[PDB]
C-alpha cells in the first residue's frame, strides 16, 4: 500500500526524527522497506497516531 | 475514547523554567506514544515535542537543548520540561494522542 508511504510523510512532515527510528522511518518514506498491515499499526501505536491513519486514503 | 489534561502552565520570566504535564486516561501513554503542540499568536498548532511509546524522543529545532520530554516512574504521566524560556515559547500548549487533545495550558512568558 503505497497509501502507508504517503501518510508516514504527512505526519513527520511538520515535525522532526527521532535519531533512533530516523534510519528505519526512512527506509518506509522512500519505499526501501515494505510497508505491511502489522506494521502500520504498530507504528501508529508507538508514535500515538489515529488508529488507521496510515491507510486513510486521501480525497 | 481518551480523556487528557494538560497542566503546569503559568506566567514565568524570560530565561526561567516550566514543567508541564499531561495526564492521559486508561494508562494510554504506557503503550502509546503521544504529541506537544503549542498555538500561539504566529501561527496555531506549532509541533513542540513527540515521545514514543517506547520513550525515544524528538523536539523541534527551536526547542532542542531547552526542552525535555518524559514519563515518569509509571510511565503513566507525560512531562515537557521548559528551561531558558524566551519570548517565543509563549502560547497554550496541548497534548493530543490517537486523535484526541485536551483543553490545553497557558504559558506565558514576561520580560
Known amino acids: 500500500k503505497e497509501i502507508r508511504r504517503l501518510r508516514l510523510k504527512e505526519w513527520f512532515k511538520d515535525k522532526t526524527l527521532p535519531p533512533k527510528e530516523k534510519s528505519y522511518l526512512s527506509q518506509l518514506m522512500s519505499g526501501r522497506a515494505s510497508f505491511g498491515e502489522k506494521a502500520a499499526r504498530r507504528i501508529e501505536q508507538t508514535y500515538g497516531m489515529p488508529e488507521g491513519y496510515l491507510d486513510a486514503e486521501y480525497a | 475514547q481518551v480523556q487528557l489534561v494538560e497542566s503546569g502552565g503559568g506566567l514565568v520570566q524570560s530565561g526561567g523554567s516550566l514543567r508541564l504535564s499531561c495526564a492521559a486516561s486508561?494508562?494510554?501513554?504506557?503503550?502509546?506514544?503521544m504529541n506537544w503542540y503549542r498555538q500561539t499568536p504566529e501561527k496555531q498548532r506549532e509541533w513542540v515535542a513527540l515521545?514514543?511509546?517506547?520513550?525515544?524522543?524528538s523536539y523541534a529545532a527551536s526547542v532542542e537543548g531547552r526542552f525535555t520530554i518524559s514519563r515518569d516512574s509509571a510511565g503513566t504521566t507525560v512531562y515537557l520540561q521548559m528551561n531558558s524560556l524566551k519570548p517565543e515559547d509563549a502560547g497554550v500548549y496541548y497534548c493530543?494522542?490517537?486523535?484526541?487533545w485536551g483543553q490545553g495550558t497557558q504559558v506565558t512568558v514576561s520580560s
Open positions: 493530543t494522542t490517537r486523535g484526541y
Open positions: 486508561g494508562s494510554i501513554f504506557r503503550t502509546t506514544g
Open positions: 515521545i514514543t511509546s517506547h520513550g525515544t524522543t
